[PDB]
Amino acid sequence: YIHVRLLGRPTYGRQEIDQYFNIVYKEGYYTMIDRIIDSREYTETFGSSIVPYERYLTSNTLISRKLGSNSVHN
Amino acid sequence: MQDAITAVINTADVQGKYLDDNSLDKLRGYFETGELRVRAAATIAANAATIIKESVAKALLYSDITRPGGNMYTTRRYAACIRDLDYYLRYATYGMLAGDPSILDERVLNGLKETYNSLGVPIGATVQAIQAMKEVTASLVGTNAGQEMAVYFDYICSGL
Amino acid sequence: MQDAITAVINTADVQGKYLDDNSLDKLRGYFETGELRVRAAATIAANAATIIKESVAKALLYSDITRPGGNMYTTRRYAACIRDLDYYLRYATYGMLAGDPSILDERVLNGLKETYNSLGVPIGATVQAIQAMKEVTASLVGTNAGQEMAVYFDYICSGLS
Amino acid sequence: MQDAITAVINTADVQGKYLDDNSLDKLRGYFETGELRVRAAATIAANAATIIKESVAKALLYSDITRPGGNMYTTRRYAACIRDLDYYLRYATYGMLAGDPSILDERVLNGLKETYNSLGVPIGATVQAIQAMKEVTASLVGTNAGQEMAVYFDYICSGLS
Amino acid sequence: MQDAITAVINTADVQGKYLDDNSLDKLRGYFETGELRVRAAATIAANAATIIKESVAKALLYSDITRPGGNMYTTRRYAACIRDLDYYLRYATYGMLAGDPSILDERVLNGLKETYNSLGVPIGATVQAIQAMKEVTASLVGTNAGQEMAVYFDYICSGLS
Amino acid sequence: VGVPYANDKVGQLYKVTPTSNIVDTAASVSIFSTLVTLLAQTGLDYELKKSG
Amino acid sequence: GYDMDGSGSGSLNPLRIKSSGVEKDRRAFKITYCLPSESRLFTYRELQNVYTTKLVPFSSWYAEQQRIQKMGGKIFKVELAAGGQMRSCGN
Amino acid sequence: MQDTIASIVNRYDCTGKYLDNVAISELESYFSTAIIRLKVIELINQSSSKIIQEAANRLYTEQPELLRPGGNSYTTRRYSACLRDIEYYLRYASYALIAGNTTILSERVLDGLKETYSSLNVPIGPTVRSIQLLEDIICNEFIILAQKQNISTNITFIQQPFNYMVKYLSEKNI
Amino acid sequence: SIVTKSIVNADAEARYLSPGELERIKSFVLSGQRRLRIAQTLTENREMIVKKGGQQLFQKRTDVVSPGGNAYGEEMTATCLRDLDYYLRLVTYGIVAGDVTPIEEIGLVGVKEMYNSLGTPISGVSEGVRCMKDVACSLLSGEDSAEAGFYFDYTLGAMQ
Amino acid sequence: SIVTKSIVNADAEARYLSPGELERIKSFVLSGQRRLRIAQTLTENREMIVKKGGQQLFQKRTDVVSPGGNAYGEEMTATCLRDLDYYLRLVTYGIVAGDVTPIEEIGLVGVKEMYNSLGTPISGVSEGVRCMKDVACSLLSGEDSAEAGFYFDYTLGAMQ
Amino acid sequence: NASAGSPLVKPKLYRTASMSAIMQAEQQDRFLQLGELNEIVAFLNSGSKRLEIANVISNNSNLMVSKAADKIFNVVRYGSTRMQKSLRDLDWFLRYLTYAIVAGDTNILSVNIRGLRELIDNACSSAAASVALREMRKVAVTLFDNDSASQELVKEYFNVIINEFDQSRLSDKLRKRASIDLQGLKLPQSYAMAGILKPKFVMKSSLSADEKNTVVKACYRQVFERDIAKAYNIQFSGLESQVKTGQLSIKEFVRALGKSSIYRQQFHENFVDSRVVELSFKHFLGRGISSLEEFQKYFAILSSNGLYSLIDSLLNSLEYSDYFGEETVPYFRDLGQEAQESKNWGAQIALFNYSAVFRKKPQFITLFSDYQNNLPDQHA
Ligand SMILES: CCC1=C(C)/C(=C/C2=NC(=C\c3[nH]c(/C=C4\NC(=O)[C@H](C)[C@H]4CC)c(C)c3CCC(=O)O)/C(CCC(=O)O)=C2C)NC1=O
Ligand SMILES: CCC1=C(C)/C(=C/C2=NC(=C\c3[nH]c(/C=C4\NC(=O)[C@H](C)[C@H]4CC)c(C)c3CCC(=O)O)/C(CCC(=O)O)=C2C)NC1=O
Ligand SMILES: CCC1=C(C)/C(=C/C2=NC(=C\c3[nH]c(/C=C4\NC(=O)[C@H](C)[C@H]4CC)c(C)c3CCC(=O)O)/C(CCC(=O)O)=C2C)NC1=O
Ligand SMILES: CCC1=C(C)/C(=C/C2=NC(=C\c3[nH]c(/C=C4\NC(=O)[C@H](C)[C@H]4CC)c(C)c3CCC(=O)O)/C(CCC(=O)O)=C2C)NC1=O
Ligand SMILES: CCC1=C(C)/C(=C/C2=NC(=C\c3[nH]c(/C=C4\NC(=O)[C@H](C)[C@H]4CC)c(C)c3CCC(=O)O)/C(CCC(=O)O)=C2C)NC1=O
Ligand SMILES: CCC1=C(C)/C(=C/C2=NC(=C\c3[nH]c(/C=C4\NC(=O)[C@H](C)[C@H]4CC)c(C)c3CCC(=O)O)/C(CCC(=O)O)=C2C)NC1=O
Ligand SMILES: CCC1=C(C)/C(=C/C2=NC(=C\c3[nH]c(/C=C4\NC(=O)[C@H](C)[C@H]4CC)c(C)c3CCC(=O)O)/C(CCC(=O)O)=C2C)NC1=O
């Protein structure tokens, strides 16, 4: 969830979550915030200027939001 | 399940109260609309076949789905497809005639999205087929009863 | 993911046994076919653009799909379509050059059918476009390497269907 | 399942050893307490109905639960409620008389938390009802056997919570 | 989460009542056991490393698990294993020192069964490792505090199973 | 008392019916032979074979 | 649910045997079969008394007779006990 | 349970195409190797329990700790269960040598197998060793009886089902 | 592997394999037979490398086999030589892979946490792997033991 | 009986009797003469149990012998004490049987339907049998009236 | 790939006396009478004798093994491993003797020595293990001669050992499926006879009223998963009586229970046609769906023709009448009985609970179809 709010996407894959989970145990939650916000993806997409925003949305959320095939014209 | 009557007795029962004038106004509303619901269910019972035929003809045929590779491409899949449209029309009629969509919660929409996402049934095409049944059915039963069927077809579509 | 070497390595590791002659034959087979895989990947790298152009020209153009109402109708949708074809071509090359279609299991075929049934992408048209890339690609790389790319394109087509 | 005997043969068996003096001390302990477990099970067998009646009377009646809106409000729900207290008493007797709560792991606490969180059965009220059965049962069977029944009722209460 | 105090304020709050003699007896019980919970958490804080080492040595090592093919085989997987035993010990200490296992419901046992059934972690071996931590921890903190740690390790074992 | 259920050697009730159809019992006896011929001719053999 | 709508061979449902009985029909046969399993020697199951006698519903009676004859049973005495016969209406 | 024939035909059902030269070539290769495949099935049909007892004795001499009190095959009962399973692996792998397709192995053996042996505390490593101890035996007997009736010696089709089940039941460290 | 590393590399760049990367693969698949000779020799000479490397380890480092050390006793010394056999196996996997990815993922990723959880000094492990490097360099050619010896050097660099 | 129950039990399991069940039959056939002492005493003291138990019943519960009650009059009171004589007889059968199968099949299976068809309050029947339990426990030893009293307890649990 | 979960399963091992004592009244939902209490009285009184027996065998094990070891026996055959195997076996019989005496009576021995004579016969003589076991039984009996009751127990255990070593492999238990789609599985008969045998309730109508009542109460527990009577006081008195006469066979009783409104009110009304299909298998056959084509078979029956024709078509099936016939109440088929197919492992153990009444989606169709398809979209 904190990954979604800070980066705008869900996690690409299992390897990615493991790094965050691992940092969690050795260094703690403060360092968990520090690794997400000082990551290269956040620095490239958002930098020092832009408030984060929702960038990627999985297929369940788009069936959910009645987009594409699902939508009622009516 | 429950109809509108059972739902009234549920709210009044779960408060512990008896039936006050609000609940009697709701029962009067249902008993005013009763006969309209009956004749609508009679007509849909008469012409279910033609509703499914016209709605498959509007929504599904001559596209990638019935072309090879699509999900309706074989005869087994075609027949399973129109079988499922028969369920949507029948349970939509039950929901109309009860005046309460709890039936659709119990016996259709529970686990159906997990089923179609398991099998590979496209949800979008299904929704468009249901809406085709909505337009054709409203054309058969008329304006008022078409609004009633419209809330239950829209209820199933909201589910998917 | 895994290549043929890793698949060989993985089998050895779970058993925990040291390499023995039967395993090596598999490694000898891969290392015999290695150069062929290399030149095939070289040629596909060279002519990706022409593969996608010729395959879209065969499979998709001047039909209901690019006419309005079809799924390729807007430019946005055309560009997303060609990009998807490019994605299939690139990962099919990774799968050919690894000698193991595990990459297509991990990074391509995962949730793609749920995604295209979500967005409205026709499965049939997609498969036909991939087969067009299979014929064009086999025409570039030749008979042998066309058979190799043919098993990975057929793997993706079997995945979507 | 397993009783204390089976558990001793499990540990001694799984070490590959024979039965040593420690395991024989455990079997001596169980065989000393055997007859007390028997007469306790006899008394609970005699007065099950009164245990459930007095425990429901102490723990559950004249509250929000039997008032409308509560979970015991109707007769079907009341009967299902006292039916479940009958299961807790019966399997608590089986756990006492085996000397090993493995039966409560196999046949009661499996899926029970998922069941009560599925239906909307309040956990807290259930726990208090079981403790009411613990006090009434301990009052019938006495001090020692009340301690034995106390560890199995507390086992079920630890299972739900 | 909630401790015993917060739970008392939850029940008395949700009835709308004030704090009566029963709830004050529960707070007296917790405030009697408080210092014992403190020194137990002190000792477990001291010897966490040795708890995990001795419990893995008793429960997991020199078996099929650390032999190739077993779950624990890769070094990566050994370190993940002992990492998870560290979480069970740490949150079991938090559950002991709160006097309420709600922490284990919120932050540990939620989604853990879906995780281990997703990965292929054997549940049985995990439970046996947790019971090994229960025996070693009870040996360090003594009888009373070992009973307290015993109800929280048994809570996690009841959660996975 | 301990009598076998249903007053028979083995305690089985609802045993197989030892009787046969009307045409068969009228045909087995030496008398009613002319009735068996008459029911044969008219075809009321057929309605007496029915199980009403 | 009267078992005679949309008969198979080309219908979606797998071929099965379908009975003439009316929906919810009260018709039964008093029957006597003698069926020996042929299959307890590889399974090693308990002996179940054979030569059973029961009242089989008319709607499902057709399935039963075919099934007894498939497993080498022998049928002794089929009587219609429960129902009335050749009635165009009312079962 | 689609053999090679039905696999090819289902592939051309997904296409919508007819059978081309490529289809007819792949079929001709299957109908050529089939006679050789039948001979292999006659071999396993002859010497089944000999193969099973040999892969047993090899399995238990390599991993003696199964018969130790800690181990799995430790009892008479657990032993007979283990031999039962080796009889399964040999049977279904023989079927996959008939069909030439490993879809029987996936549909009837492998799906839910990792979960079952995980549920019973049966170890995975011994199981994979068992399958390849079957593979080596059938391989050797086919090399000898191959060189008798002269034959094409090649054995990749025999190695393929057992290799498939080994690749499936394995754990990935890479 | 080298193929896996290049596919991962241009996968993360989402481009086709670059010409430079492709050239390396050719050099890899042409250097195959030499690598298989190396792993063949280290395969068939493993008992000398594990035994002799363990002897030079325990002779250089009399700590761990002393009473009070980790590896004191018959069983513990057998477990110590068992681990040297593991890292020998992994080195042979790294030679035929043409990359240390097998060595890294089977043996090195979180090794420090494991041996710290065992009470084992990992510097003794690195001294053991260096001893096996000296024996394995005694069993090979010049350039050959340069290559294989450098795989051992990678494992030393991961332990330290 | 215990013999009947064991034979039926391993008959439904289609096996011989277990060593455990045969030990149970040995303990039963050795406990015989104590049981026959108990049922001898309750046999020869039946009139005190029925009379005194009926007095404690009617004194505790003046409902049923009041006017308009189920037991009003001389004939009805005689029938009431007749039924208490029945349950005393059945308890003696259950003592010599070593099982409550006689008590259950002669007296308890469908007792609620019978007394509800007679208009008789069955709670008064259970109070009567409890009174006879107190008298019969006054006529016996400690462990003896524990055993016999527990057969009465089974009948009380079946009535309630 | 896909899977069901992998829940913990106690495999089966053996029984003790207080074990099967408790478990019989547990299986019939009873609540122990005086007689079964008198089992646990008898076995739990006489336990210290068994302790003295395990004492003296545990003390004298070496002496017991050597006196067999001399007259059984070779440098010139029989390597070091093989000699260790025979020695391990002689120690080993004594181990299961102390276990079989301390625990309940004779289940470890009987299932762990019955087949093995031919597992050993490829190595050693049949006359060898006989004379080794007979020297151990004679030294044990003559050791225990004082305290005659204890050697009577002991004599019974050894005599059962040398009875069970005599006999056979116990044959093979096979499972042939009439339908082509399903897959056959065999089970060793040694594996099945460990545990507690699950009783089968048979109503011949010549029984006594206990035996009719237990069979009928077993039917309600099978079809409804709980006792409907004794809680909600639901009675079906003429189905019950037409079964007590044998007028309805027990198959037709399960049919008329399956077509009652309490079955549909309990199981059809709250569930999807897929879920109704699944639960109809659990109640009417006592197994899960074997495979995907069978689900597509019966789902057409339910889905086109309602519940009544589904239950009719399940009880008219040719696989109902070989497992059950018409004289047994249906029963579950878990681990103790038959061969459990791997394909449905976890899901089947998901079914046979009380809790799998509550599962609202479908189990099996998602699982089989998910086995056909590739990785789904969810989280990792
Ligand atoms: C009462 C609630 C309920 C529903 C709705 C239900 C649906 C259901 N749909 C199925 C298949 C199917 N359903 C469809 C439906 C469609 N294909 C399309 O392209 C269209 C969008 C759509 C028709 C409008 C198809 C093609 C299949 C079979 C797919 C296959 O087997 O490959 C199956 C598989 C087996 C069987 O049908 O017997 C079930 C159980 N089951 C239930 O219990
Ligand atoms: C609504 C947004 C939208 C646009 C604009 C669009 C364009 C579009 N232009 C096309 C072709 C084309 N477009 C051109 C255009 C030109 N040639 C020149 O030299 C000039 C610079 C220019 C005309 C001013 C030509 C020559 C082709 C066909 C080229 C070929 O097929 O070889 C095609 C190929 C197939 C087809 O037309 O049906 C599409 C889809 N599609 C869209 O959805
Ligand atoms: C031994 C094995 C076993 C147990 C223990 C068990 C419990 C169980 N409890 C149930 C329902 C219930 N359980 C309760 C229980 C309670 N209500 C209260 O307020 C109390 C606080 C609490 C009891 C202490 C109630 C009211 C229901 C009925 C919910 C409903 O269906 O309406 C149900 C659903 C079936 C039914 O009764 O209608 C099961 C299956 N089932 C089993 O097979
Ligand atoms: C406190 C909150 C919390 C817990 C408890 C937790 C568990 C957890 N265990 C995991 C994996 C694992 N867990 C184990 C555990 C075991 N292997 C064995 O053989 C033992 C029997 C057993 C431990 C006793 C192993 C080997 C893996 C790695 C599977 C893999 O990714 O390769 C993973 C996947 C991420 C990763 O480690 O790579 C999570 C997320 N996660 C959490 O956020
Ligand atoms: C208590 C429960 C229990 C028993 C009793 C048992 C017996 C048993 N004996 C075995 C083998 C054997 N058993 C023997 C026995 C003998 N050879 C001789 O010449 C003698 C006459 C005779 C002994 C008196 C031998 C030689 C083998 C090894 C066969 C082989 O695998 O090579 C094996 C196969 C596993 C192995 O040892 O490698 C079992 C499982 N297993 C059990 O779990
Ligand atoms: C057709 C596909 C298929 C397979 C393979 C299958 C296997 C299978 N193996 C089982 C048990 C088992 N399988 C083994 C196997 C072994 N033990 C070892 O140490 C060795 C590594 C290995 C023998 C080579 C053992 C010991 C058990 C029983 C374990 C126990 O019950 O405690 C069971 C449990 C119940 C039963 O057998 O009836 C099944 C269902 N089922 C299937 O449907
Ligand atoms: C393939 C990658 C891999 C490795 C390397 C690995 C190592 C590993 N080393 C272990 C123990 C051990 N390893 C050592 C090693 C040493 N002692 C010393 O003093 C020396 C420095 C060193 C030998 C050079 C010792 C003493 C133990 C056992 C310690 C104990 O149990 O107390 C264990 C415990 C259980 C078991 O061995 O079965 C594992 C799993 N596991 C793996 O999966």
Concatenating the DSSP letter of every residue in K234-298 gives ---HHHHHHHHTTSS-HHHHHHHHHTSHHHIIIIITTS-HHHHHHHHHHHHTSS----HHHHHHH
Beta strands in K112-188 (DSSP E): 172-173, 187-188
Give the helix/strand (H/E) hosting G79.
Answer: strand G79-80
Rounded CA-CA distance K165/K133 in Å is 9
User: A52 near A6, Cβ under 8 Å?
Assistant: yes
Read off the tokens for C136: 């064009």
Ligand 7 pocket test, candidate residues E56, E61, E64, E73, most atoms within 8 A of CB: E61
How distant is the Cα of B64 from the closest Cα of chain C, in angstroms? 6
Ligand 4 pocket (Cβ < 6 Å) reads A 18, 21; E 65, 71-72, 77, 80-81, 84-85, 87, 108, 112, 115, 119, 121-122, 125-126, 129
- Is E75 touching ligand 7 by the criterion CB < 6 Å? yes
Place of tokens 């879920």: K275
DSSP string covering chain H:
---HHHHHHHHHHHH-----HHHHHHHHHHHHHHHHHHHHHHHHHHHHHHHHHHHHHHHHHH-GGGSSTTSSS-SHHHHHHHHHHHHHHHHHHHHHHHHS-THHHIIIIITTHHHHHHHTT--HHHHHHHHHHHHHHHHHHHHHHHHHS------HHHHHHHHHHHHHH-----
How far is Cα C150 from Cα J17, in angstroms, rounded to an integer?
Answer: 69
- Scan residues 5-64 of G and list those with Cβ closer than 8 Å to F: 30, 32, 53
G57 has which bridge partners?
G28
CA-closest candidate to residue E105, choices E155, E33, E141: E155
Residues facing G55 on adjacent strands? G30
Query: For residues J77 and A9, what is the distance between their CA atoms, to the nearest angstrom?
Result: 86
Which amino acid belongs to residue I70?
N
Contact between K299 and K174 (Cβ < 8 Å): no
Alpha helix locations (H) across chain E? 4-14, 21-46, 48-59, 75-98, 102-107, 112-119, 123-141, 143-160
Determination approach:
cryo-EM
Helix (H) or strand (E) holding D119: helix D112-119
For K78: left if phi > 0, alpha if psi spans -120 to 50, otherwise beta; the answer is left
CB K19 within 8 A of CB D1: yes
H25 C-alpha to ligand 4 centroid (Å): 49
The number of C-alpha atoms within 13 Å of B95 and in the hemisphere containing its C-beta is 25
Query: Which residues from chain I sit within 8 angstroms of residue H173, using beta carbons?
Result: 105-106
SS3 of residue K172 by DSSP: strand
- Give helix B4-14 / helix B21-46 axis angle, nearest 10°: 150
Q: CB J115: neighbour CB atoms within 10 A? A: 17
Q: What are the structure tokens assigned to G20, written together?
A: 């003439």
Give contacts of K245 with chain F, Cβ < 8 Å: 13-14
What is the distance in A from the centroid of ligand 6 to the CA of H85? 5
Q: How far apart are alpha carbons F33 and H156 in whole angstroms?
A: 83
CB E131 within 8 A of CB K20: no
Residue K187, SS3? strand
Rounded Cα distance between D141 and D149, Å, is: 9
In the block, tokens 């440098």 appear at K75
CB D20 within 8 A of CB D9: no
- Is residue D160 within 8 Å of D112, Cβ to Cβ? yes
Residues of E in contact with H126 (CB under 8 A): 64, 69
D120 at interface of B, judged by CB pairs closer than 8 A: no
Q: What are the chain C neighbours of B69 within 8 Å (beta carbons)? A: 123-124, 127-128, 161
Please indicate whether residue B80, judged by its CB atom, sits closer than 6 Å to ligand 1: yes
Neighbours of G65 (CB within 10 A): 17
List phi, psi (to 5°) of B68: -60, 135
Interface check E101 vs D, CB under 8 A: yes
Q: Does D124 touch chain B (CB under 8 A)?
A: no
Cβ contact, residue pair I7, C13, below 8 Å: no
Does the CB atom of residue K117 touch ligand 5 within 6 A? Answer: no
State the Cα–Cα distance between residues G7 and C32, nearest whole angstrom.
60
Using a 10 angstrom Cβ sphere, with 0-12 exposed, 13-18 middle and 19 or more buried, the burial of residue A51 is exposed
**Is the minimum CB–CB distance between D63 and chain E shorter than 8 Å?**
no
Q: Provide the sign of the torsion angle of the four alpha carbons B140, B142, B146, B149, taken in this order.
A: negative
β G28-30/G79-80 pair status: antiparallel
Residue with tokens 């740690």: E149
Q: How far is CA K167 from the centre of its chain?
A: 22
Atom of ligand 3 lying closest to residue K231 CA: 37
Q: At what angle do helices I111-118 and I122-138 cross, to 10 degrees?
A: 120
Q: How far apart are CA B96 and CA C61, in angstroms?
A: 46
Contact with chain E for residue C15, Cβ under 8 A = yes
Chain B 129-148, residues with CB within 8 Å of chain A CB atoms: 131
* C chain contacts of residue E68, beta-carbon cutoff 8 Å: 13-16
Residues 6+ apart with CB under 8 A from K219: K201, K250, K253, K254, K257, K329
Residue of D nearest to H70 (CA): D14
DSSP 8-state secondary structure symbol assigned to residue K46: T
What is the rounded CA–CA span in Å between residue K355 and residue E45? 40
Per DSSP, helices labelled H in J45-121 are 46-60, 74-97, 101-103, 111-118
Q: How is residue K215 written in tokens? A: 């069979």
Those chains having 3 or more beta-carbon pairs within 8 angstroms of chain E are A, C, D, H, I, K
Pairwise CB contact (< 8 Å): H173 & I101: no
**Most distant pair of Cα atoms in chain E: their distance:** 61
Q: What span, in angstroms and rounded, lies between the C-alpha atoms of H151 and H160? A: 19
Q: CA-CA distance, D2 to D95, in Å (whole number)?
A: 10
- Pull the structure tokens for residue K251: 């198959």
Cα-based distances in Å from H127 to E67, H55, H118? 13, 11, 12
Q: Are K194 and K170 in contact (CB under 8 A)?
A: no
Which residues make beta-bridge pairs with B68? B70
**Does residue H121 come out as left (phi exceeding 0), alpha (psi in the -120 to 50 range) or beta?**
left
Cα–Cα distances in angstroms (integers) from residue I104 to residues C63, G20, I39, in the given order: 53, 72, 18
Contact B23, B120 (CB under 8 A): no
Q: Establish if H16 touches chain B: CB-CB under 8 angstroms.
A: yes
Q: Which ligand is nearest to the CA of H117?
A: 6
- Of F29, F46, F22, F27, the closest CA to residue F37 belongs to F27
Q: Which residue of A has its CA nearest to K380?
A: A14
User: How far is Cα C85 from Cα C106, in angstroms, rounded to an integer?
Assistant: 18
Q: What is the CA radius of gyration of chain F?
A: 17
Listed as own residue / partner, the contacts of J5-14 with beta carbons closer than 8 Å and 24 or more positions apart are J5/J99, J5/J101, J5/K35, J8/K210, J8/K211, J9/K24, J9/K199, J12/K199, J12/K200, J12/K201, J12/K202, J13/K197, J13/K199, J14/G46, J14/K200
Under 8 Å between Cβ of K330 and K284: yes
Torsion of CA K40, K46, K51, K52, to 10 degrees: -170
| Chain E residues near residue D158 by CB distance under 8 angstroms | 151, 154-155, 158
User: How remote is the CA of residue D110 from the centroid of ligand 3, in Å?
Assistant: 14
CA K5, distance to chain mean position in Å, is: 22
Q: What values do phi and psi take at G79, rounded to 5?
A: -115, 145
Say yes or no: B80 contacts chain G, CB-CB below 8 A.
Answer: yes
Pocket lining: E61 vs ligand 7, CB cutoff 6 Å: yes
Q: Which helix (H) or strand (E) holds C16?
A: none
DSSP single-letter state for residue K2:
-
G53, G76, G85: residue with CB nearest F52: G85
* Residue J72, CA atoms < 13 Å, CB-side half-sphere: 7
Read off the tokens for C139: 């025409």
Instruction: Check H124 against E69: CB less than 8 A apart.
Output: yes
Least CB–CB distance from K252: residue in G16, G55, G59: G55
Length of chain A in terms of residues written: 74
Beta bridge partners of G28: G57
* Residue I47 Cα, gap to closest chain E Cα (Å): 20
Q: Does residue D61 have its Cβ closer than 6 Å to ligand 3?
A: no
| I106 Cα–ligand 7 center, Å | 14
Distance CA I86, CA B124 (A): 54
Token pair 């068969």: residue: F24
E96 neighbors E39 (Cβ within 8 angstroms): no
Residues E133, E147: Cα–Cα separation, whole Å = 13
Cβ of residue E161 closer than 8 Å to a chain D Cβ = yes
The closest alpha carbon to G42, from K174, J146, H2, belongs to: K174
**Which pairing describes strands G33-34 and K172-173: parallel, antiparallel, or unpaired?**
unpaired
Task: Give B136's Cβ-side CA count (13 Å radius).
Answer: 22
> Considering every ligand atom, which ligand is closest to the CA of K83?
5
Which of J98, J106, J120 is CA-nearest to residue J158?
J106
Contact between G59 and K255 using a beta-carbon 8 Å cutoff: no
Chain center to CA of B46: 16
CB D112 within 8 A of CB D159: yes
Overall resolution, Å: 3.5
Rounded Cα distance, H94 and D38, in Å:
57
Q: Provide the CA B51 distance to its chain's centre, in angstroms.
A: 13
Q: Chains with 3 or more CB pairs closer than 8 angstroms to H?
A: B, C, D, E, I, K
Residue K306 is classified by DSSP as H
Rg of chain B, C-alpha, whole Å? 18
Residue C63 CB coordination number (10 Å): 11
Question: Do residues E145 and E37 make contact, with C-beta atoms less than 8 angstroms apart?
Answer: yes
Task: Tell whether C66 lies on the interface with I, counting CB pairs under 8 A.
Answer: no
The residue among E83, E89, E107, E110 with the most chain A CBs within 10 A of its CB, best to mutate, is E83
Cα E50 to Cα A31: distance, rounded to the nearest angstrom: 27
CA of D33 to the centre of ligand 7 (A): 46
The position carrying tokens 């006698």 is: G53
- CA-based Rg of chain C, rounded to a whole angstrom? 18
Per-state percent for chain I, helix, strand, coil, to nearest 5: 80, 0, 20
Q: From the CA of B85, how far away is ligand 1's center (Å)?
A: 9
Which residue has 């993922």 as its token pair? Answer: I105
**K200: its two tokens:** 């089968």
- Cα distances (angstroms) measured from residue K24 to each of J21, J104, K21, K119: 12, 19, 6, 34
Distance separating alpha carbons of residues E153 and E147, to the nearest angstrom = 10
User: Which letter, b or e, does each residue of E73-103 get, where b requires 16 or more Cβ atoms within 10 Å of its Cβ?
Assistant: bbbbbbbbbbbbbbebbebbbbbbbbbbbbb
